[PDB]
């Protein structure tokens, strides 16, 4: 049973099966969002999304939380914006304190704790967003997907939104083919999205370990591959 009538109209309620139906409904909110994927390279990570009076150089979906770490979310715009800004605050405070880029697992932890805290009290609702974030790191590169429950894990690839199932299937076939260079992963991300395009990547070899947008020549080459 997916509805859970009588245990759903308030946050923090456990149903008799121990399910928090408000959390399942916030997950179901993610299933409506723009299909978005991330791919983990040998050297880095790449993110891609499926997405007239808008100023086009200002209409951007992938959010750089820090030069160290890139972020893409799906679900509720304002919840995504809020979580992104909270993460950017946490990254900036970590950097001010410890004079180093925030380790991707520490950032992930801080975000998971912030989201999870919104599951504890009836006076707040879970975030209606699932976020894929990742970047190059002192220990390599990490890709995380943070569900609205606050559950998070590292991934070799992740997809969210309405197309998430087919994206997951194709990204899993891709992983089965490469048990990737930044170039190849960019091409495959473009393909998976095609299966407007916008891409960004972070790799030690090809972005000096910073997060950067994939734009211009390489974007057109990825579209040609797709």
């Amino acid at each position: 049973t997916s509805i859970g009538t009588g245990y759903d109209l308030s946050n923090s309620v456990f149903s008799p099966d121990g399910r928090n139906f408000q959390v399942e409904y916030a997950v179901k909110a993610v299933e409506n969002g723009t299909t978005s994927i991330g791919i983990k390279c040998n050297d880095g990570v790449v993110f891609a999304v499926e997405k007239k009076l808008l100023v086009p150089q200002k209409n951007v979906k992938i959010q750089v939380v820090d030069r160290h770490i890139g972020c893409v979310y799906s679900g509720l715009i304002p919840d995504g914006r809020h979580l992104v800004n909270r993460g950017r605050e946490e990254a900036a405070s970590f950097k001010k304190l410890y004079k180093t880029p925030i380790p991707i697992p520490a950032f992930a932890d801080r975000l998971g704790q912030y989201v999870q805290a919104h599951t504890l009290y009836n006076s707040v609702r879970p975030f209606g967003v699932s976020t894929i974030f990742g970047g190059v790191d002192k220990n390599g590169a990490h890709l995380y997907m943070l569900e609205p429950s606050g559950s998070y894990w590292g991934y070799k690839g992740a997809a969210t939104g309405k197309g998430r199932q087919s994206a997951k299937a194709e990204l899993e076939k891709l992983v089965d083919h490469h048990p990737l260079s930044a170039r190849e992963a960019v091409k495959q991300a473009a393909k998976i999205i095609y299966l407007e395009l916008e891409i960004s990547w972070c790799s030690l070899s090809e972005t000096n370990g910073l997060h950067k947008f994939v734009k211009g020549d390489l974007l057109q080459e990825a579209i040609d591959f797709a």
């Binding site: 605050e89 405070s93 970590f94 801080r110």
Partner: protein, 142 residues
């Protein structure tokens, strides 16, 4: 990130700074009958030559708590102090008891004071305004 309470003196003073005890006839002066402090004679200007310790001992625990929250913000991030504070405010705001002086049994657990005594515990220390109704009005802000 303080050990000794630093911010410990009022920067601004006014006859109206003390709310809930204002004259209804002239909403600019204290109500010296409702104050029950022994007249106006405890005029606010007499808050002078305070004991050097008092301004630090009153708010020592508050300063320790603020340092603890700061440490949790630095190490664990904004989530942990937020959670702690939300729990604490839930406890404080749901425990209403106009007759008991005693601290809440759960407040002590959250503060980790289950096995701690202080002099504020040992020494927990009126014709007008002592009534249960005055406490109701303070708590609801009537």
């Amino acid at each position: 990130m303080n050990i000794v309470p630093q911010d410990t003196f009022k920067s601004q003073v006014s006859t109206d700074q003390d709310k809930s005890v204002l004259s209804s006839a002239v909403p600019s002066l204290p109500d010296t009958l409702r104050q029950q402090e022994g007249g106006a004679v405890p005029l606010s200007t007499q808050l002078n030559d305070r004991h050097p310790l008092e301004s630090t001992l009153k708010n020592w625990e508050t300063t320790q708590r603020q340092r603890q929250m700061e440490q949790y913000r630095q190490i664990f991030g904004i989530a942990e102090p937020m959670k702690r504070t939300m729990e604490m405010e839930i406890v404080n705001r749901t425990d209403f008891n106009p007759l008991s002086t005693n601290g809440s049994i759960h407040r002590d657990i959250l503060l980790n004071k289950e096995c701690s005594i202080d002099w504020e515990d040992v020494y927990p220390g009126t014709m007008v305004g002592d009534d249960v109704h005055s406490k109701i009005e303070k708590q609801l802000g009537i």
